[PDB]
Amino acid sequence: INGVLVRCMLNIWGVMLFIRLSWIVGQAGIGLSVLVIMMATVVTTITGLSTSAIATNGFVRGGRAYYLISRSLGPEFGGAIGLIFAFANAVAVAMYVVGFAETVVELLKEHSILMIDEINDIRIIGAITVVILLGISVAGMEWEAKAQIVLLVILLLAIGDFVIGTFIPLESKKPKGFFGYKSEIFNENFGPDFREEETFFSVFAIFFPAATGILAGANISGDLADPQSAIPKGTLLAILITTLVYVGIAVSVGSCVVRDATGNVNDTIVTELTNCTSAACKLNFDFSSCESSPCSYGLMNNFQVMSMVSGFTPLISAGIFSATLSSALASLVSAPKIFQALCKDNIYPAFQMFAKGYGKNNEPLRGYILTFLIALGFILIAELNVIAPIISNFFLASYALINFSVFHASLAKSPGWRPAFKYYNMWISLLGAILCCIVMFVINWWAALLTYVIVLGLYIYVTYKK
Amino acid sequence: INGVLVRCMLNIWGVMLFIRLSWIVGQAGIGLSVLVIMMATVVTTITGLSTSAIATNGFVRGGRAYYLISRSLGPEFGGAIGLIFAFANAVAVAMYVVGFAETVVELLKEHSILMIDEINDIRIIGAITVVILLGISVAGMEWEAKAQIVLLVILLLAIGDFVIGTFIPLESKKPKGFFGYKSEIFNENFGPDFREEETFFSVFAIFFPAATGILAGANISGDLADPQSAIPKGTLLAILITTLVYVGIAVSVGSCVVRDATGNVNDTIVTELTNCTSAACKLNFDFSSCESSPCSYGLMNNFQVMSMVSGFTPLISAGIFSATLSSALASLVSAPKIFQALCKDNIYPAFQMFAKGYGKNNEPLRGYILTFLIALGFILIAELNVIAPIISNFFLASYALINFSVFHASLAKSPGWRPAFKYYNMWISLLGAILCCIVMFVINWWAALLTYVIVLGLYIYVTYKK
């Protein structure tokens, strides 16, 4: 009730927190953003209750995450969810690491230093980073147990430092959108003023990965040093804490940083008593009239608002490093584990090359190379705002699959289904599945369709390979 | 090999032939229109081969169409295809009858006569028409056997009269877009010049019902006075003939009527030697410069181009009446038959009120009232261009269902599957199903999605009612 809790809590706080939440709230108002977070959290908690019901039905010996599912679910749903989820984690590696690389090139361009083709300097940085990350994962993880705790200490210190910065309204940040909890800054920030082409569901898709750390946080750490049936409590409480801190950070940054701010001491508080519609003039002449040209930063231009508000910004940057690298590595170790587990069962005998445990320990290698290559291929696409909707798609697909499969097995299944989680009925799981599918189709309907024909073909193969 | 042949050939030539084909070719060029027809016909013929394989597997005693399917397919696919297809025919009634009503108000407004709210005078006409059609269907059909033959004589005479009119270039039609097989009229008509908001798939969806008469043409006439295993030959040959005459009428009208023509002897052949880009001036000053205001008619303005080209236009109008009324009535008798057959089996016991055969013969009444009311509700929507995509959706769904179900049963099914149709393998049926689903999603993805959750809920009900 402490190990997998910390694991999920690490997996969930990812890149989208420090570098995208300000974005989201800047586009979808302080109000509607809460609806975004609430939809995300209801999907996640439906899936959490369902996966809990899974984690409280079978034998006490939880072999492997995918093996746990295959025990508690048919090989059709088993292999489907497994493959689609391992792919989800594989692409998630690239998502997290490219967010990291983005913040690196940001903190670097802040200096005098520069690189070749920033839009692809991100690509070079991400490549070196994923190489070093694979090198970390393979050949050693004994230290990760103690490393996750220090990472979480760093991360919580970063969040607390952010909030402690909010209450400290330095005048030098007046040229930035930060103003320190003004009511009118909150008023003007409640209406969902969107931007160039984003719609509510585009923003939701961007945000959704920031709520996706639950299953691999819990299940992938099957056979935990803790009892198996402790997973649900920690998973759900972690969901609650993460979503609550999401809501808090959301409301705070919305009531703190204005929609746009061209940092210029010149364009400042000179205080000509004008018409004064927006909240900027309400504060002072600072951050006035970005409507003409694209301004530098503030809640809708730059993603560095979080690092801009807090005190001793190094701690916030360290928190970013911790979150992104940690989540990326967790996904990078969970994905090939699922691959090798599914392949050792030879459920899909086409990928019979289960990496043969090429190592002194049971360290798969073929899966590592595969997911590393996928991560590279996706890293090549730089703009995180386009990688993230794909992860959104695939994780929504995975969640739909899993909770729908629970719903289906609930339709009486001779295989020992017999779950135990309080509040784990079928109808809520069918609700979650319909929600997942609908939401997935609203965000790039054709991607969802293609995903579904993929899983259909998987059902075919699993149906006639028997 | 003559009865169900004539039946399908009647069901297929519907309203979309005489009043929409000219439209389609006017928007999607003489060339691309052939691709439209080819996609339609490949879908239809895949489904035809599959339904043939069905019609050549089971007992010699073909009880009922839906019963034939339930014999040769599981009650899941059975009831799904049955309900969705009966609904398809129900809405098809309204489609055909509203096309009829449209041509009636056209031929009436051509006179001095008029009605109240033409856009809903169509609705009033359609209501009276569907009332009279229900009155025809119930309480007597003994004459329909001899009536279909005279209807087909009328229809073929209309088509032949149309083509015989093409070769007769009356000067009085020069103010209309008709010119009589000019090469340049064909050249300018090969490029898919679309219009206000139509896309290739919008046009395809409009067209697709014009290729949907096969299953109900053949299966609904189960226990034919002909042997059961004669269905495939006639069905496929009817498909071939209908699609070939579609291609012929398409190429002809494309090479005959220009894209736009403001009928005015004044704006005519006066023959000022201008720049002359379009083919109009190539012919003469007639039908020149519709680009300014919306012109009266010709291959893109009015749907009466077909009736405008032929000689003794009354015959063409009679052919329209024959086609629309005939197809409408065939659908109106096929839909409730499927309803009462599915309900007598009580597959979906919610609709246990199977009309109890309230009549001296086995004449269902509850189903009649139901489909009549649905037809009314849809008639209320007047613009055929919006009703037709819905029928396209639902028929694509039905075809996807049926051929996919054949594909699935091909994955070895202990129920006696054992078909016989030459060239009836699985892979082509899976191809047809994937095509149906993809095409259905390109045309109003959310309608397709909703249809699929409907059939999923049906799978639920059929799964836990057992």
Numbering used by the authors:
A (entry chain A), B (entry chain B): 288 to 753
In the authors' words:
Cation–chloride cotransporters (CCCs) are secondary active symporters that harness the K+ and/or Na+ gradients generated by the Na+-K+-ATPase to extrude or uptake Cl− in various cell types. NKCC1 is one of the most extensively studied members of the CCC family and plays pivotal roles in trans-epithelial ion absorption and secretion, cell volume regulation, and regulation of chloride homeostasis and neuronal excitability, among others. CCCs belong to the large amino acid-polyamine-organocation (APC) superfamily of transporters.
Here, we report a cryo-EM structure of human NKCC1 captured in a partially loaded, inward-open state. We identified a human NKCC1 construct that eluted as a monodisperse peak on a size exclusion column and yielded homogenous particles suitable for 3D reconstruction by single-particle cryo-EM. This construct bears deletions in two regions (255–278 within the cytoplasmic N-terminus; 941–1000 within the cytoplasmic C-terminal domain) that are divergent among Na+-dependent CCCs, as well as two single mutations (K289N and G351R). We determined human NKCC1 transporter structure at 3.46 Å resolution that allows for de novo model building. NKCC1 assembles into a dimer partly via an interface formed by TM11–TM12 helices within the membrane bilayer. Ion binding sites are organized around these hinge regions with partially charged side chains, main chain atoms, and helix dipoles playing crucial roles in coordinating ions. In contrast to LeuT and many other APC transporters, NKCC1 seems to harbor multiple extracellular entryways and intracellular exits that converge at central ion binding sites, raising the possibility that K+, Na+, and Cl− ions may traverse along their own routes for translocation. We intentionally excluded K+ from our sample in order to arrest NKCC1 in a specific transport state and accordingly did not observe K+ density in our map. Using this kinetic model as a reference, our human NKCC1 structure would represent an inward-open transporter partially loaded with a Na+ and a Cl− and arrested on route before binding K+ and Cl− because K+ was excluded in sample preparation, whereas the Danio rerio NKCC1 structure represents an inward-open transporter fully loaded with K+, Na+, and Cl− ions.
